[PDB]
């Protein structure tokens, strides 16, 4: 029932994500010199360094907000990919599966703790 436990749990999951080779295309903002039309397709860029910095600044109130930004990294990759078989998009799908598998208990524990707080 610890309402604050999600933050360190998210920090540890982000550390695992940064160790994953599949996260390399998503660690830093997409470079416009490499992908000149990126901002014609993607309105809201997101990357794992931005998520980590937002968490560390104390700018997430809940793990749901962090989850929304991580999911935006994956939806941006899906929207930008020229093919559903592209290398970077394929890496995004594996990384998304790994993230969803691990974030599930973080979200459940937070929501349960909050329900207990408001009982
Ligand atoms: C984030 C992303 N998703 C893509 C899907 C397909 C092709 C490129 C893609 N990028 C950019 C890779 C980078 N510039 O770091």
Swiss-Prot record:
Modified residues (Phosphoserine): 90
Tissues/organs with expression: Expressed in myeloma and epidermoid carcinoma cell lines.
Phosphothreonine carried by residues: 44
Compartments where located: Nucleus
Domain Bromo: start-end pairs: 1-106
Primary role: Probable regulator of the insulin and insulin-like growth factor signaling pathways. Stimulates cell proliferation through regulation of cyclin transcription and has an anti-apoptotic activity through AKT1 phosphorylation and activation. Plays a role in the regulation of cell morphology and cytoskeletal organization.
Disease affiliated with this protein: Chung-Jansen syndrome: An autosomal dominant disorder characterized by developmental delay, intellectual disability, autistic features, anxiety, hypotonia, obesity, and dysmorphic features.
UniProt subunit comment: Interacts with IRS1 and IRS2. Interacts (via bromo domain) with acetylated lysine residues on histone H1.4, histone H3 and H4 (in vitro).
Protein name from the UniProt record: PH-interacting protein
Gene: PHIP
Covered residues, full protein: 1316 to 1434 of 1821
